[PDB]
């Protein structure tokens, strides 16, 4: 649920990833809606779409208004731990990162398109560097349907197992003035991912859910055009008649056929981040033929328990996972690099 946001806001601490749990907590920190910054709008949809936690990376004040570090911050900052995307490195809880603000720079002309690609590509490197969080990518505004497919395959071509894309922007409703405004769907989509955390579990892919907070969709997409978008790893949002606004498609920005679906990756990062918390027998005990036996039992007693809630094919625990931590997988040349083991989990979607 813990989402991360990078944006420009009027005031507040600079480049310090503060924690906010309610929309009012945001207001005391970094104002609200002043100056037309997209960060204030984007988090509002996330807060209104469920999700009780959020992290904000304020960089760029009210008015170098926008640059690579100032504004759409991207520098690792020599691991300064409080600059750019490095601020999220010392968290180990954040599982959703988004970059709403930088696209205002594209609209306001303060940045070049080739500079946008580097910022998002650097973000993907951040997700790949860590092991859990998933980044949500936004496409350039008013891209036009027949041209966005070209844009993904030629301009960016990200091809990573840690990114999600959602094409048409959202005409959100500002309660302060009741005026429709255009905002990227990075904030709102992350709200859906938070709803699935609490209800239906991480098993179910975040799709076919109301994008509540929305009013209209610029450049409506018909089904025939959509089928030229889904197989190439691009999601879509459509106005289904009499059913509101729903998110269609659960494909991640990867080409590896074994990781196409979003929930599988959403499952695994949850799965890997669960056992490593559980099995913290490191810098502890003696690497020997005894400990490798226990690790096999400790993991197995969890994956079987992961089958109780479903989300594991097999009709029987023994047909779900397969764990091998015996002696022959740790050679006598342990060289302290030993304690290796394998595991399995699978239940993708429609």
């Amino acid at each position: 649920s813990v989402a991360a946001f990078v944006g420009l806001a009027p005031t507040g601490p600079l480049n310090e990833p503060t924690l906010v749990t309610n929309w009012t907590q945001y207001v005391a920190a970094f104002g609200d809606f002043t100056g037309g910054y997209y960060l204030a709008h984007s988090v509002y949809g996330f807060f209104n779409n469920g999700g009780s936690a959020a992290y904000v990376v304020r960089v760029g004040g009210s008015a170098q208004a926008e640059s690579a570090h100032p504004g759409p911050a991207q520098y690792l900052g020599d691991s300064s731990d409080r600059t750019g995307f490095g601020g999220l490195e010392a968290i180990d809880e954040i599982s959703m990162v988004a970059v709403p603000d930088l696209m205002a720079a594209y609209q306001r002309g303060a940045i070049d398109l080739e500079a946008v690609k580097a910022v998002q590509l650097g973000l993907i490197a951040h997700c790949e560097l860590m092991g859990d969080r998933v980044a949500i990518i936004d496409p350039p505004p008013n891209q036009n349907a027949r041209q966005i497919r070209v844009w993904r395959q030629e301009t960016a071509g990200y091809d990573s197992k840690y990114a999600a894309l959602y094409y048409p922007w959202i005409k959100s409703f500002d309660p302060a003035t009741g005026q429709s405004r255009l905002v990227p769907p990075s904030g709102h989509v992350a709200g859906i991912w938070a709803r699935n955390d609490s209800e239906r579990g991480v098993h179910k892919a975040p799709a076919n859910e109301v994008v509540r907070g929305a009013v209209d969709l610029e450049l409506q997409i018909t089904r025939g055009e959509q089928d030229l978008l889904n197989p190439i790893g691009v999601n879509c949002i459509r106005s289904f008649p009499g059913r509101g606004i729903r998110v269609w498609g659960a494909r991640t920005l990867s080409s590896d056929p074994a990781w196409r679906y979003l929930n599988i990756r959403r499952y695994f990062n949850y799965l890997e981040e669960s056992i490593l918390i559980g099995t913290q027998w490191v810098v502890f005990e003696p690497n020997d033929h005894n400990l490798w036996a226990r690790i096999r039992r400790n993991v197995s007693a969890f994956l079987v328990n992961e089958w109780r809630n479903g989300a594991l094919f097999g009709q029987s625990p023994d047909q779900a996972y397969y764990v091998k931590c015996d002696e022959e997988t740790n050679p006598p040349e342990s060289v302290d690099l030993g304690r290796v083991v394998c595991e399995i989990g699978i239940a993708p979607v429609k």
Binding site: E199, N309, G310, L312, F313, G314, Q315, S316, Q319, A347
Partner: protein, 225 residues
């Protein structure tokens, strides 16, 4: 020859708002409640009524008449537990989200059609026990009250009764062994009511039926008895 085939599912009780206007299907979803333990035993019952007076002018046994068909019944058994996290309020909150099924929903009172929400007990491919039903009685037993007063283990019974879903809104082929008199007996039950069959079709000679022709047997509307 299966769907998921080799997966485990959890039965979940689905609650729906009652229909408002001239409608029979339940309205939109208001709260979907997933079980913590699938029921150990599920009981389905059905009863019919047949009044049968025992007397006559001759005191012989009298043919009973069909009075009506009683609705179905189901007796669930919901078990909830949080004994491995004492002090948590998961069970107490969950039950309080289950007792909504015995009070008038606020939306209905606005429309002057008060009714408690309808429920559906959906579980995998269990087609027999998945119908539009209301909740009759909820007997709940609480056990092992964790410290600070929160309950931990609760057993909740249910009585479900199926709500009917009614209002879903005669050509015959003559075979070599079929005759007009037999056709009348096959569908009408009166041997000498064959005159009606030839009337609708305009068949004149009742002894030349073309093998393979099509006949239209009208309903009993010509013989109201």
């Amino acid at each position: 020859s299966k769907g998921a085939g080799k997966s485990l599912v959890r039965a979940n009780l689905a609650i729906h708002e009652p229909p408002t206007g001239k409608s029979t299907s339940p309205g939109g979803l208001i709260k979907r409640f997933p079980f913590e333990f699938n029921p150990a035993q599920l009981s389905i019952s059905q009863r019919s009524q047949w009044k049968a007076t025992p007397t006559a002018a001759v005191r012989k046994a009298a043919k009973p008449q069909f009075m009506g068909a009683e609705p179905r019944e189901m007796t669930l058994e919901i078990f909830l537990d949080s004994s491995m996290k004492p002090g948590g309020n998961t069970v107490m909150k969950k039950v309080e989200s289950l007792l909504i099924c015995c009070e008038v929903t606020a939306k209905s009172l606005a429309a002057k059609q008060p009714s408690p929400p309808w429920v559906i007990f959906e579980w995998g491919s269990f087609s027999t026990a998945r119908f539009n039903a209301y909740v009759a009685s909820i007997e709940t037993q609480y056990t092992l009250f964790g410290t600070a007063g929160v309950p931990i283990r609760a057993t909740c019974q249910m009585g479900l009764v199926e709500i009917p879903g009614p209002t879903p809104n005669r050509v015959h082929r003559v075979v070599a062994g079929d005759s007009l008199q037999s056709l009348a007996w096959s569908e009408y039950g009166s041997a000498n009511a064959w005159r009606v069959i030839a009337e609708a079709n305009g068949i004149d000679d009742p002894s030349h039926l073309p093998t393979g022709t099509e006949l239209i047997l009208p309903a009993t509307e010509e013989v109201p008895h």
